[PDB]
């Protein structure tokens, strides 16, 4: 059946553009997420940092503790969550307790 | 190749040899190559030739 959709039609018959957003949660997680806010790197009186998901408080530094080009984490013998390289500039970082 | 939690993680590492190979007496680690998030039921596989 055909729609008329003349400009003088009543509100009950006026056309409405309907957009439906469908979301799937199957057993196959991927990188389909929303946008995240990005800030500037801060050290020197350590501030709280949330680098790519993990959160810490240590002193960001530019030490020569070079990781592998595929690793994105850092852990000591005590499984301490060491700093991760910069997700943007790929600069290697390291953290220590802030006194 | 692995299929766990939907991620088809592929590990690989190119290692040169010197003579005939029979899985020689050497150690070498494999680095992750890709992390395809498809979650495909993979129960068979065939080596593709040219």
């Amino acid at each position: 059946q055909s729609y008329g959709f003349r400009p003088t039609y009543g509100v009950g018959h006026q056309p409405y553009r309907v957009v439906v957003l469908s979301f799937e949660l199957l057993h196959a997680p991927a990188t389909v997420c929303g946008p995240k806010k990005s800030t500037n790197l801060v050290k020197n009186k350590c501030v709280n940092f949330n680098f790519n998901g993990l959160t810490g408080t240590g002193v960001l530094t530019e030490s020569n503790k070079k990781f592998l080009p595929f690793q994105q984490f850092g852990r000591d013998i005590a499984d301490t969550t060491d700093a991760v390289r910069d997700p943007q500039t790929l600069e290697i970082l390291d953290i220590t307790p802030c006194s | 190749f692995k299929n766990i939690d939907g991620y088809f993680k592929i590990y690989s590492k190119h290692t040169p040899i010197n003579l005939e190979r029979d899985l020689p007496q050497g150690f070498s680690a494999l680095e992750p190559l890709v992390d395809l998030p498809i979650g495909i039921n993979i129960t068979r596989f065939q080596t593709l030739l040219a």
């Binding site: 595929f70 690793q71 994105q72 852990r75 | 590990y11 899985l23 007496q25 680690a29 494999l30 680095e31």
Partner: peptide, 26 residues
């Protein structure tokens, strides 16, 4: 369309300490 001429028998051999990979990106 394909031609079936690649099928052949199998064999066995002794391996070594192979297949070790990085279980995590840490």
């Amino acid at each position: 369309q394909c031609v079936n001429l690649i099928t052949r028998t199998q064999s066995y051999t002794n391996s070594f300490t192979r297949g070790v990979y990085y279980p995590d990106k840490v």
